[PDB]
Structures are given as C-alpha cells and as structure tokens.
Design a protein around this ligand. Structure first.
Ligand SMILES: CCCCCCCC(=O)OC[C@H](COP(=O)(O)O[C@@H]1[C@H](O)[C@H](O)[C@@H](OP(=O)(O)O)[C@H](OP(=O)(O)O)[C@H]1O)OC(=O)CCCCCCC
Ligand SMILES: CCCCCCCC(=O)OC[C@H](COP(=O)(O)O[C@@H]1[C@H](O)[C@H](O)[C@@H](OP(=O)(O)O)[C@H](OP(=O)(O)O)[C@H]1O)OC(=O)CCCCCCC
Ligand SMILES: CCCCCCCC(=O)OC[C@H](COP(=O)(O)O[C@@H]1[C@H](O)[C@H](O)[C@@H](OP(=O)(O)O)[C@H](OP(=O)(O)O)[C@H]1O)OC(=O)CCCCCCC
Ligand SMILES: CCCCCCCC(=O)OC[C@H](COP(=O)(O)O[C@@H]1[C@H](O)[C@H](O)[C@@H](OP(=O)(O)O)[C@H](OP(=O)(O)O)[C@H]1O)OC(=O)CCCCCCC
Ligand SMILES: [K+]
Ligand SMILES: [K+]
Ligand SMILES: [K+]
Ligand SMILES: [K+]
Ligand SMILES: [K+]
Ligand SMILES: [K+]
Ligand SMILES: [K+]
Ligand SMILES: [K+]
Ligand code: NA
Ligand code: NA
Ligand code: NA
Ligand code: NA
Lengths: 328, 328, 328, 328
C-alpha cells in the first residue's frame, strides 16, 4: 500500500468516472485558473483572436450591406470606416478598436447608424473580454498555494520522552521573513480499519491532537517549531511500542494553514509521514543560536535528528508501570 | 410540509414585505453582482451609453456656447475640437476620449479653458465608470459559490452500527483535483417543535455533532469521506427507532464550507436530507481502489448504499440493553 | 449614561489626543478608502491633475533645454514633439500620453534621448497612478460593511420561559436571497463594575453565551432566527428578576459576522439593546408561513412581540424553587 | 538574552543557510510584493523596457527580413509600418502598441502576414505584463500589515488583584474609527526550558489563556480594552511571586488578528513584553470619559499605569492561604 500524500504535499488520488462534466463548465473560471499556464496562454490567445474575427466580419458585413465596398474612391460618399481596402483591413480596425490602439488611419464616420452601436457593443464587450483574461491572469499569478512552496516540514517524525510523556513530534518551518497570519496546524491519522460489524473502511481519517484543546495549535511561526503530539489514552499511538511500530501500517498527514501576509489569501501546505518515517527514540537537533542581536536559524540542522535514551514500551504500558510505581 | 433546502442546495424561502428597499441601493454593488448576467450585460451597456451621451451633450453645449458651430470652415479660428460636423460627431469624440480610442480625426485644441478641464473631468470619471464595471464583472466571474457546483453530497443518509454505536452517516465529495482549504462540515437539524410553555417554533434549528468537539469536523477532503454523526444521549436521534423514523418529520441540512484554493474566497455548498432520504440499516458502498501507484475513486459507487444487519431499536434502548448486559 | 452602540450599529466613541498621526499616512491606503466619497473624488481629481502638470512642465523643460521653442517653423530640425505652440500644448500632450489617448497631432520624434526615457518613465508611473486610484475605487465600491445594511436585528430583546429555562432572546434577519457564508453570532454584555479591590472598570465587556460551546452560534441564516441566550448560573442575567431589570444599567451588544457570498469578504453587522429595550415576559411573533411550495417570511412581524405568562422571579430563584420542588 | 519580538512587532530572527533558494522564484509573486518599493519601482521599469526592446527588435527583424529597410521612399511598396527611419523608430512603435498609445504616425499595413500575428502576440502579452505589474502594485499598496500600524499595545503589562484573583493584564487599542472585523487576541509565553530527559528547548512557546475557553478572546474593540490573563493553576505565572519575577527570564508575545473592515484582508499586529516590562502591583489608568453624547478616549492615559496595594505572594501561595482561611 502506497502513501495517500507525498512528502511534498501532492495527493496520490485520481477522480474517475465523473459523469457530470457539465459541472466543470458551470464554474469555468475555476477550471481555467486551475489549468497549466500553457493552456491559459493558449486560450487567452484564442479568445482574443476570435473576438477580433467575430467583430472583424461584422465590421465587414455592415460594410458590405451599406455598400461601402462597391465604390472605394469617390468624393461625395464616405464609408463607415475610411481605408478598408479588403478582407484584412477590417481585421486591423477590429484590433485598433478592441485593444483601443486606434491608429487613426482607420477612422469611423457618420454615415451608418449600424456602425455607431457596434463600436459601442464592441468596446463594451471589449472590456468584458479583456477584464476576464486579466482577472484570470492576476488570480493565477497571485494564488496562495505558491506560498506553500516556502513552508517546510521536517523529513521525519520522532517519538521520545518529554517531561514524563511519550510524544510524537515533527518540526515545521517558514523560509520567508514574512508571516503566515492565523497560521495553524492540524494532523490526520490515515489507516484502514474494520468495524466490529465487518465494515472495512479503506483510508479512515481520524484527527490527531496537536494543540486544539488549548489553542496551542494556533502557531506564531517565526523560527522552526517542533509540533508535539502527546501520546495519551486518546492517542492512536497509545498501544504502540517500539517493537510494534514497524509492523503498523499507518500514515500521518500533516496540514499547515494560514494567510499569506501580503495577499490576505489562505494557503495550505501539506506533508506526510508513513510508518517508516517515524523514528522511535529520537530528538530534533536544535536549529537556534543567538549571534549579536538576532536569533540565527541554521537550516542545515532543520531535518536533522539524534538518538536519545528512550523506553521501548508503548505509552499505555509506560503509564501502567508508572501508576503502579506511585501506588507502591 | 415541504423541505427547507433542496438536494442541490437552494433554499425554498421567499422574503416578502421587505419595506426598506432603500437598503438594496445603499449597497448597490451587492445587488448588481447578485443579479443575473442578462441584467448585468444590460446595465453595463446602459451605463456606458449614458456617460457618452451626458458628456457628448456637454461637449456640444460648450461647443455651442463658445461659438464653434457658427463657422465650420474658417482659417483664423479653431474650435475646441476639429471636425464636429453635427449632432452625432460629438458622440464619436465622446467615445474616442472615454474609451480613449481617440482616432485623432477629432482632436482637442487650445481655444477654450472650458474644454481642457472637461477632458480631464471625463478621463477621471471615465476611469471610475470603467473600473466599477470591470470590477463588477471580475467579481461576478470569480465568485466562489460556483465552486460549490463541483462539491457533492451523497443522495441518501444512512443509519447503521459502527463499533457499537448507532451512527447517522452521509458521504461528501470534491470532483476537482484542487483543494478546498480550511474545509469544514456542519449540519443542522430542522424540525418544528413546541416548548412546554406553548410556543410553537416553526422550523427550529439545532446543530448536529459531526466532529466539532474533536476537530474532526475540519476535513482533509481528497477522496470522498463518510461524515458520521454518532447517535448518543445528546443526539436528536437518540430516541428514534427504525419503526419511528418514517413517522418523524424532520430535515437535516448539511453544510460544507471552505476556501477555493485558487482565489482565497470562501464558498458554501449545501444539501438536505428529509426523513424519507434517511435509510435505516444501510452502509455506503466503498469507492476507493488502489491501482498502480494512485488511489482510484469510482464515482459510480459514490451515491450507492447496501443493506446490512442492523438493530431496529433506538440508540437509547440499545444502550439501555447493553448497560444491563454488562451489569449482569 | 448613553449607549455604547446605537441600534443601527455605529459606536458612540471619539478617539482624541491621538498624537501619532504619523501613523495614518504610514497606511495611507486605509485612510483613503475610509474617507467619504467627496474626499476620494477630490483627491482622485487632484492626483491626476498634478501628474499631468508635473510631467507637462518636464515635457516643457526638456523642450526648452533642447531648443525646440526657439524655432517653431523650420524644415530641417524636428522637435521632440510636433505641435507644441505654447504653455498649454504640453499639457494636452501630457494627457494624450498618461491617459494614453494620444490624438497623434502631438507626436513624439527621434531628436532627443531625454524624451524617449521620459515617455517611458511617464507610462510606467502613469500605470502606477491609474492603478492605485482604480484599486482604491474598486475596494471602496466593493467593501463588505455595506452588506451589513441588509442584515437586520429585532428592535427589542425578550425574556421568557422556554422548556423550563428563562431565556434572553433576540431575532436576526437577512433581507437578501443570497447567503452570509460562515455566518456567526456573538454578544457582549457591557456594564460598569468595580472589583473588590476598588478598581472601577468603565464599560466592562463580558461575552454572553449564544451557542459557542455547541457550535449553535454558527448560523445557517435564511429566514429570521431567534437567537437565544439561556440564563443559567454563568449568565450575567442569573440574579435579575423582572422587578430588578429596570433598575439595572447594562447594554447587550449583538454582533453578526460572516462573508458576503459574492465577494469572499467578511462583514460585521452590529446592534445594541439597552436595559429599556429588553421586554420581560414576551415572545417573538412568528414570521413564517408555508404557501404553495415556498416558505414565506412576513417581515411585517419581524420586530413584533407579544406578552405571555411568565414568572417574575430571577432565574436563580426559579432554579432554587424548582430544585426544592424536585427535592420534596 | 535578547527579546524574540520587539515592542513594535518585528521579530529578531534571521533565516540562514536556506539552500533551496529555487523556492523563492517558484512563488516569484510573493518575493516581489514582499520587496521594498525601490526594488519594485526598479523591476517594473526594467520589465517594461525589456518588453519594448524584445518586441522592438522583432519589429525590426521582420522589417529587415521583408525588405522594408532597403527602400524607404517608393510609391508602389508599403512597409509593415509606415515611418520607421532607423534603429530607434521601431522602439517608439513598440511603445505606441504595448501601451497602446499608437500616435498613428507609425501605422501598421497589410503587406506582411508576419506583422499581423505579432501585433496580436504583443497586445496579448502586453496585457499579461501590464496586468502582472498593476496587480503586483495594487496588492503591495493594499496589504493589511499596514493596518497594524494603527493598532496599539500598552507599553507595559501589569499584575494585580481583580475580584480575588491575581491577573496579568495588558491594554490594547485601535486608533481608527473603522473596525477590525473578527478581531481576536492570543498570547504566547516564550521561555527556554529543559525537559526531565535533558532536552533543552531554546525558545519554547506555550499559549497563555486570554479568553479562548469562553470566547472572551474574540474582541469587540472600539475604545481600548484591558486584556486580562487570570493566573490560575494552569498559568505559567502560578508560582511566580513579586520577589521572583525580576529573576525570571521570559517573554510574553502578544498577537492581535482580525480583518481590515474595508479590504476583507486579515492583518496581524504584534508586541512583546519582556520580564522587565511586567509591573507587579499596578493598574491601568482609565482612558474613558463621557462628554456630551459620545465616549471620549484620552489616549494620553493609554500607556499610563498606577500603583495599588497588592500582595507580594505568588498566586499559588495566595490560593493556598485563602483555601486554609475558608477551611478554618
Ligand atoms: C509554456 O510555458 C508556460 C510557463 C510554465 O508553465 P507550464 O505550462 O510549464 O506549467 C506549470 C507547471 O506544470 C507547474 O509545475 C504547475 O504547478 P503545480 O505543480 O501544478 O502546482 C503550474 O500550475 P499552477 O499550480 O501554477 O497553476 C503550471 O502552470 O509559464 C510562464
Ligand atoms: C443572456 O445570457 C447571459 C449569459 C447567461 O446568464 P443568464 O442571464 O442566463 O442567467 C444566469 C443563470 O440564471 C444561472 O442559473 C444563475 O445562477 P444561479 O442558478 O442563480 O446560481 C446565474 O447567476 P449567478 O449565480 O451566476 O450570479 C445567472 O447569471 O451569461 C453569459
Ligand atoms: C459628493 O457626493 C459623493 C457621493 C456620496 O458620498 P458622500 O460624499 O455623500 O459620503 C458618503 C456618506 O457620508 C455615507 O453615509 C458614508 O457611509 P457611512 O455612513 O460612513 O457608513 C459613506 O462612506 P463609506 O462608508 O461608503 O466609505 C460616504 O462616502 O458618492 C457618489
Ligand atoms: C525610493 O522610494 C520608494 C518609496 C519608499 O519605499 P522604500 O524603498 O523606502 O522602502 C519601504 C520602507 O523600507 C518601509 O519601512 C518598508 O516597510 P517595513 O518596515 O518593511 O514593514 C516598506 O516595505 P513594505 O512593508 O511596505 O512592503 C518598503 O517598501 O515608495 C514610494
Ligand atoms: K476547542
Ligand atoms: K470546541
Ligand atoms: K469551543
Ligand atoms: K488606449
Ligand atoms: K489610443
Ligand atoms: K490613439
Ligand atoms: K491616434
Ligand atoms: K474552545
Ligand atoms: Na517566518
Ligand atoms: Na479534491
Ligand atoms: Na438570506
Ligand atoms: Na476602532
């Protein structure tokens, strides 16, 4: 069985037999900005070209219906647009007006009522197309998920004693000098199970306590923080000894959410720990040192761990043995 | 009695005798973007045309007051704008300036102080109108409620045993490969009641526990999740047996909220279960399979349920019978 | 003593002797969009005019330094800009370029290196000014606080029995067919106090329970909801009888927060109840009726209350008397 | 040991040996808007100039390949662009088209297929560059962190009795007449520790209760509020007497988060109290007075404190002595 989430945060999941694809067009905006730049840069170019054409032919049709084509050199009659020499000239005008470059070689004149209301309709719809594409671009340029790129998770998780309690720990970092606002950490245990009743539940999610009851899950994340899950009665890890752990088949998905200081927008950084990435009996190497009026983070030690003396017993047995020690 | 919320999420409610309609114009922005596209495409066209007119007449009035109309072919005097042959020419200029196409057949000149400050006033207000409409368009194009279109809720809810407890379950899905960020699930029971004191409360809302005390209500929603409400003492469903359920007249409104990964914006997807859509003694069909390095969701099974052996007793009686079994 | 918050939500507070006014310019954006439209429409006009001037003189200075003014009619030499007849012509050009209308009577030419890099600098800064003002406009046009205009609070609060408990109730409404997303209700009791130690605390805020422990404070607000605060031991209202209430000097500030469905933006609607707006022994008139497949809200009854049989005793004494009734 | 956070909110932390600098370009948007204006104003100018060049040479290359340069004065043949006299003329045209000023001295004509699709490609990419830079500007102009500038924290924290309990108090303010929406206050104690097991934890963060269990941490912040942390068994301050405090080496980081009323965007204001900024046995001076129908805040007293009779004992000993007083 392969992991549900990769160490970089992408999920190993494919959505198949989605029969209502009608839905992807119902929010087209979302499908567009979700697309790869290649697809956006293409569509943008296509959308622009078809608008110039679709109006360039309408500019040519009205030019043909009015009878401007017939005489192209007479004093008395003036066409809707001066200088429209053929099949392509209307295309340049259609651009001069929608991009509003309007070189003024191709100029509108009074003769057709049909012309004025078109230039109007164009300019109006010329704003609606241009906006949509710019809008679409800005969003895609400014989307938060990119910030996740500079949010890092320690490569392993560790289990070791902390003031009498066995803790599952992982370390988290923000590489930017800016802040993740309303930052918070949650974590899900993913492992298959079967209920007494027989129901096999493929990749069952159960939330792991990492501060939610005390609000310690609400981070102030400048220098890297070790996030710590205390293995108590309620922990999924309560009955797991050093010796059992490798035989367990589970995955902890670790999820960091907050807002990009600059754009108020919320991002989500993810990582994952499969059973072979949890080191029993280890500790995270310090990364902080105080040099001349600033705290210096040595990211060379960010992922680094070291072994310490640690019980091999499950937290449950540790407790039981301690409660009897007290009780003697 | 008909449902408060339809399976697609729209609410069967009409607001009548709203006497302060003065309020809808106090936030006009909101009424506009809430309108149907037909109404936006109309207004946009109207707003543009009236600005060109309202300035086109001011351009004609100043042109008339200065005395430019009188002589249209003399060497010495130059008008505020070259080439203004009649009632319509000013309209083209009024467009050439606000859309800033400015074909340069119609060009401004120095003779009137009144002209320069107008072109200024126009351009300034020409930005304020254009912005407003673009702004209005982008919003309406980029609004989150559309994402809800690709968020799905299982067609039925089910009640069946799970590790000794009777649970009310429904299944939820996200059809897009992108993430709903800070996703969460809440659910309200809607049913009429009467207090001891006589007060009849038409469609009384009471929240249903679906993870809020443990933070299990905060979803990591990739492949579909069965959301599970354990029917305990506090549940509205505590004293409801298989046999009573059909006689009950209640509705569970199910509400999913989160942020569209791309635009940081929060959306809300809704669905509803009326009493005849809750299947007692059923289970959701698995939708997950593991094929060659990715988890495959078979959405053909998304809504599908199957019958399993299940007590017909209310959870309350189940508990009572179990507590006595233990007590023997 | 006058109320801290008015029934419409504005706060009766003035900030005086703010000595660091340096701060209002440090976030100028915020001061600008907070200003009245009159001040925005003014500034916008001023900012535009000064940019055209400040560049119009630079266009005239370079025109003077190069020696273009001296000869205005010679074949061999061409100026940086054709047709600059005097002190004002440069101003039109300065507009033709920043608004990018560029009528092409005033056209740039090759003779000056100093000219090309200016047109560049202008256009670049011409985008930075135009953006800022548009940006500033859109925000101010699209700000959420306006939505609050269509969020309503019942005019009175009521106290009366509900299933054995004395409750403080108020009613809340949303006049729009759209949704407030992640809507929620909180309420603060404001009243002066003095600690045992002597410390007089002018307008002390203490939060009033209206659903926060059960998540009932998270609204699904379609038709109007009666928000209900149960007066228990923890309530500020525990030792207040019908007879005491009028002598009490307190204010309940009621605060509704959520996101405008269309623009993801969060708004806050406020209202207030002073001691004389709390009716003891009343109930809210129903506003819901079911007519032909939709629920109809009759907003004529929204604020309306009616009297019902209700104990005159404080909830504390009610409890005490009930606990002794049980105990007999 | 120097403070982790300064009184103005900046953090004394440097990120060193960040080896994956590849990441800063992966979200370039974020690095750009995070930069100083000098760097933005520079880049903006550079990006614009290189686009005009990169297209100005392509306009010159096609002009050279077609054979327009060779003859610059002949009747029969027309170039792709009229009036391109040399190495610089193409640059003006490249500007006339991307800024869409298009003075119409330099005008496109029909002769080259290669020209039309370029003008198209330019205009299309001319929108993508202009958008990006405007977008980048608006964000940077409109970023919330600036609002923090008008959110203030009292200069000291105080410890003194309040209705029988020893409290750690600090005062917070909002200088603007506008509201911070969904405002909230949290606070972290930062102090080094060593676990029983030996593990030294450099600047250990533990959250301090300031209202989170009752929702009193959710502010309605008009006039300044004294935020109060009750020193109970769970408080880090439980075993700290007046006499010990100065010997303690700890820092309370105080964090205020909410949304700028106008732009829905979330900001975070920070301040810090090191051990020598906590005054034992003091109280905050009132800042509220009621003058003629509005509450007047006298910010001259905002930071001001005064001494009051206060026990010198740790809250723990205070409790113990009180519990024995009751027990006698
Ligand atoms: C032709 O070149 C276009 C060029 C690169 O973009 P290109 O087409 O190679 O595609 C991008 C690339 O696949 C990234 O890895 C994607 O991020 P993720 O891995 O999907 O997160 C990104 O999507 P988003 O995530 O940025 O939308 C894609 O846009 O863009 C200038
Ligand atoms: C003339 O054609 C205009 C064309 C279609 O739009 P059209 O006028 O048919 O109206 C849309 C249609 O009614 C959708 O069903 C609406 O969604 P919902 O059902 O109300 O959610 C939508 O509102 P919103 O929800 O998109 O604002 C409406 O705009 O738009 C291009
Ligand atoms: C000259 O006319 C300008 C015209 C009206 O605007 P005007 O200058 O009369 O001022 C508006 C008016 O005072 C509103 O009552 C304000 O709302 P609030 O009461 O302060 O909430 C509003 O502020 P905001 O709240 O909209 O920023 C003000 O802008 O705008 C077109
Ligand atoms: C050349 O002048 C450019 C001029 C001033 O900007 P300038 O280059 O001096 O730099 C700004 C200055 O350093 C502020 O103190 C910064 O705020 P903070 O202290 O870093 O918070 C600000 O960053 P941000 O925080 O505004 O991005 C900087 O942009 O801008 C018009
Ligand atoms: K909690
Ligand atoms: K909770
Ligand atoms: K809670
Ligand atoms: K233009
Ligand atoms: K133009
Ligand atoms: K032009
Ligand atoms: K022109
Ligand atoms: K809580
Ligand atoms: Na950081
Ligand atoms: Na998904
Ligand atoms: Na509503
Ligand atoms: Na304020």
């Amino acid at each position: 069985i392969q992991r549900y989430v990769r160490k970089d945060g992408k999920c190993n999941v494919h959505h198949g037999n989605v029969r209502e694809t009608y839905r992807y067009l119902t929010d087209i905006f979302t499908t567009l900005v979700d697309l790869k730049w290649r697809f956006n840069l293409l569509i943008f170019v296509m959308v622009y070209t078809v608008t110039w054409l679709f109006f360039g032919m309408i500019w040519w049709l009205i030019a043909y219906i009015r009878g401007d084509m017939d005489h192209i050199e007479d004093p008395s009659w003036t066409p809707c647009v001066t200088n429209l020499n053929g099949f392509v000239s209307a295309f340049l005008f259609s651009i001069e007006t929608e991009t509003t470059i309007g070189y003024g070689y191709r100029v509108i004149t009074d003769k057709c009522p049909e012309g004025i209301i078109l230039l109007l309709i164009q300019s109006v719809l010329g704003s609606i197309v241009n906006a949509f594409m710019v809008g679409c671009m800005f969003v895609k340029i400014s989307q938060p998920k990119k910030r996740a790129e500079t949010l890092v998770f320690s490569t392993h998780a560790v289990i070791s004693m902390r003031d009498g309690k066995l803790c599952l720990m992982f370390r988290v970092g923000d590489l930017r000098n800016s802040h993740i606002v309303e930052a918070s950490i949650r974590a899900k245990l993913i492992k298959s199970k079967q209920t007494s009743e027989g129901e096999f539940i493929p990749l069952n999610q159960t939330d792991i306590n990492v501060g939610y009851y005390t609000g310690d899950d609400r981070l102030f994340l400048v220098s890297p923080l070790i996030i710590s899950h205390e293995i108590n009665q309620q922990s999924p890890f309560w009955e797991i000894s050093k010796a059992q752990l490798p035989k367990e088949e589970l995955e902890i998905v670790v999820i960091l959410e907050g807002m990009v200081e600059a754009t108020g927008m919320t991002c989500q950084a993810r990582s994952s720990y499969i059973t072979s990435e949890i080191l029993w009996g280890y500790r995270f190497t310090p990364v902080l040192t105080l040099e001349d009026g600033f705290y210096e983070v040595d990211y060379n030690s960010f992922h680094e761990t070291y072994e310490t003396s640690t019980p091999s017993l499950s937290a449950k047995e540790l407790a039981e043995l301690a409660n009897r020690a007290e009780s003697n």
